[PDB]
């Protein structure tokens, strides 16, 4: 599938698991589903931190239905980015 070009919203509060990860429930606003969810994690400085995504190949099936995304944030301040473009959903996180 092609990468999602649209915007994402949070369907519910970000939930902390009992294994140092977070569950992000995202809602897709674009019209190009089925599509692959653009996902990235950054440090306080804004440098991309690799291999933090737990959910393998997150995909939007139906835009009306939200998608669960599990990610492992690093210790301290970080940023969880869902979607493509400069206007993408950027979540400030502290672990």
């Amino acid at each position: 599938y092609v990468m999602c070009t649209g915007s994402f919203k949070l369907e519910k509060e970000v939930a902390e698991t009992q294994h140092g990860t977070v569950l992000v429930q995202v809602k897709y606003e674009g019209t190009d589903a089925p599509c692959k969810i653009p996902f990235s994690t950054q440090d306080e400085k804004g440098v991309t931190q690799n291999g933090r995504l737990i959910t393998a190949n997150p995909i939007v099936t139906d835009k009306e239905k939200p998608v669960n995304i599990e990610t492992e944030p690093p210790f301290g301040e970080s940023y969880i980015i869902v979607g493509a473009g400069e206007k993408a959903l950027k979540l400030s996180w502290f672990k």
Partner: single-chain antibody
Amino acid sequence: KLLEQSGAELVKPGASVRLSCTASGFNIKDTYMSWVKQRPEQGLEWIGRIDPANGDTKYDPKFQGKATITADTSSNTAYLHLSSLTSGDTAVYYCSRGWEGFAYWGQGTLVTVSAGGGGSGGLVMTQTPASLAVSLGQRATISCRASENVDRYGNSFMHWYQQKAGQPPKLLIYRASNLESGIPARFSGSGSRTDFTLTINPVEADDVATYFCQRSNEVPWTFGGGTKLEIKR
């Protein structure tokens, strides 16, 4: 419309009533379902929300001892239960879905409390101006000030709605500055933490409506008092 509500109710004072809200196309389990009260010609009042995945309920303190919210994921339905009905309960009740603004609304259910004795009644959002007389083609500005910080995860959970006569509200802006899909570019939002602004530039004839801001970072997900926008007379 993906949210279908039960029919109008005519109920006796002191009695109880249950309203239903059935979803189609998506699982209510995967969302936050809210109930919103609107007394005749008055503002939107957030009653509470249920997370049907775990059954968690949160209410505005004003509704404690008046409203109860339940959900049934099996039948994809959310319910509102009102106790000891009084004239103050006569209103249109809407169900809605969403956290970063309510993009989905039911058509509303009118509850009319009949005449007679019986029943009992049981964060600050400052929206200005209460009334706005506009010149078409001008820049129209509506402000909302919260008594507490509305930011979460470095984003401002401030949303804006438009409501036209005899219609449910429509989401315009979410997360303070993000334009809802299908909304014209003349609508823009700005602000952070406690101070926010909705700008309509240039204002057009079809923008005549009542506008509401709302915060949702933490409960209660309080609406502003509203701004009735009309063309100057």
